[PDB]
Symmetry: D2
Subunit: 221 residues, 4 copies
């Protein structure tokens, strides 16, 4: 009943500020919500070349794109056609801290995303300011309800140059715009986000994500 | 460069839990006494749907009494100025990031303030407005990776006598190169809403701050 | 390695102290290292009945029992006959902190486990001290190397009476006793741990665990 | 009930990153003056393969000078005593927990102390013994769910002049029923290793602590 199509278009605008550095980034993409896959082309419109690792932004560029089995309530697909919003904190191991918010609507065959991303206290010689990141590793988000609110936790890690890892704790709260959307029980979403291609300074980036929900062992087998 | 009696002009724009607002400030202080106060008026998005107290530390470390034996980073930052960025991490998962760009012209400090906040639970003391005041505090000032940083254990006193904790981390950066960094030291703070109309569209705010070196010196 | 047999026995003694409460717990179990499964009977020997939730103890009662595929280096199985030890911090959401450690050796077809578990700062009214826990949820541990030391991080959650969850961050460091045990790259271990039965005061508990390593999406 | 001059007897047992140790302490102090010192001797585990500094705040809040306008929980706990439990969360993932049970008879405080630590990085400043001292600090004392609790932003000064931060959360509980709880207040602390032998098998330790109510009261 979402009126979501097997093939959806995606438009996005992000505005934000990290360590005092302002930026605006536009995105235009497409995806398959029932296969849990999406991809997007991003262009930095203000603030480029970004003076920090593009990677920290990428998870902010929609859990509608996650393959849900029939036995787990899919809160995100049921939030539509109206939509939903999420709010996230990204707590990095060296004290960098970011918060982000997305309001997601839908017209026709298109999701519209209004994304804000603010961060500070990244050390000047850390991997983020020094642009030493290579990618996010795959991850598994733990989804559960806390005082009526769908919440997601993830231990994330950025692979660095030299092959060390730089850890980050995500916590996201998700809220349907309409009242009454039924809450799922405790479950998982596996993710893998990748930059497919980019120019030298990441002014232009092609992003891809794949996500699948599941119930853990022994169920996931 | 810094006068004993200074004025303060301020504009804040911000968004907390999806709610946009703009607040203007006009005040005065005595930089060498560590004192200031300001009148605030909500110009847009009023009355705020959340506790005004979360905003008050965002409304200038130039207003702190520094003794002779501690480098005063802030007073040395003028006339060019400095800026600060701060995370406010509340215990129920509410999180804000605030920043201020502070310039000077004649006897007046200008402050351009941004305040962004997410993840305050609908039933927590912030959205339910159960806050009474911040407790006084002692900020620990130190240097990390070349940057002057302050951490503070903050707490808001609540209706019903409990406290709601918040961890502050602020980075401070002089606009001019080669301003000399101080060593590890402390700044005691007391901030207080002296008065306010019913809905907090208008607020009179006061702060007192004194830098020190901890025991056994203090 | 040839040191690990398809059926292994387990002997275990745990001593610890939680919120000033001393206890000792014995255990005797069996597992199937290549199936990723094990099972144990535990008995409280001193300090029973425990005044706190038995669940906080259960992950302290051996990553050898995890099913590893061929394309991921299996540090745990590789570490025998000599063995390995691990040390873990359990940081619960209300300020309760536990520190646990196991030193694991092998004699014949048996793992011997020297386990310590210590805990402080559990609020008297919290679910641990009030015994409101029902079970750990299944979990996914992130395994990576930090400074030449194999490390696992896990977002764990205890399901509580009333349907809410009580959160805990695990961080475990694993150290082979010998130097020449090749380190794996970044990978995952799914876990599911379960108390199969227990008597009223948890003086006697039967415990079970199933674990499987994988490499995340798209492989799986 | 507490004398102006008290003896202190202590033993600590613990284990950091898998290394076991037993340490004995014999000291004296002046409870009403907030001053204390103690001679420590390593009895087992010597020489310690980690920074002795991480242990020193586990080696009694009765030794803090309280003004009359703040309820002194610790002194009011005696003769029966009290216990404290602490978590020490280091910025690099090192974490310790500690507990002390404190009793008294006549002129002597007795201490039964346990200290456990883990996940310190083999190359970090604790395992490499690159710490110099703790900075002075200010502990925020407040009541949470009927329990007196203290939070501190601690920092170890390191060789090379960086600071290694630690967050301390302590809860304190009187043994006897009905000890009245204080309002929100502060305790300034300064701890110092006065002298030590080469591998810290023997150490002289000193602390001074003074409770206060923050600005403006000073």
């Amino acid at each position: 009943m979402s009126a979501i199509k097997p093939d959806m278009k995606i438009k996005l605008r992000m505005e934000g500020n990290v360590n005092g550095h302002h930026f605006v980034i536009d995105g235009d993409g497409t995806g398959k919500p029932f296969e849990g896959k999406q991809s997007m082309d991003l262009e930095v419109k203000e603030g480029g070349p970004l003076p920090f690792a593009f990677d920290i932004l990428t998870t902010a560029f929609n859990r509608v794109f996650a393959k849900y089995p029939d036995n787990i309530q899919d809160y995100f697909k049921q939030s539509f056609p109206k939509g939903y919003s999420w709010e996230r904190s990204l707590t990095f191991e060296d004290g960098g801290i970011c918060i982000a918010r997305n309001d997601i609507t839908m017209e026709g065959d298109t999701f519209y995303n209004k994304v804000r991303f603010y961060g500070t206290n990244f050390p000047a010689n850390g991997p983020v300011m020094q642009k030493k990141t290579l990618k996010w590793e795959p991850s598994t988000e733990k989804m559960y309800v806390r005082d009526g609110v769908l919440t997601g936790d993830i231990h994330m890690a950025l692979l660095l140059e030299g092959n060390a890892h730089y850890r980050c704790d995500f916590r996201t709260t998700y809220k349907a715009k309409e009242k009454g959307v039924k809450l799922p029980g405790y479950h998982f979403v596996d993710h893998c986000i990748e930059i497919l291609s980019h120019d030298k300074d990441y002014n232009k980036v092609k992003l891809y994500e794949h996500a699948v929900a599941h119930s853990g062992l022994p169920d996931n087998a």
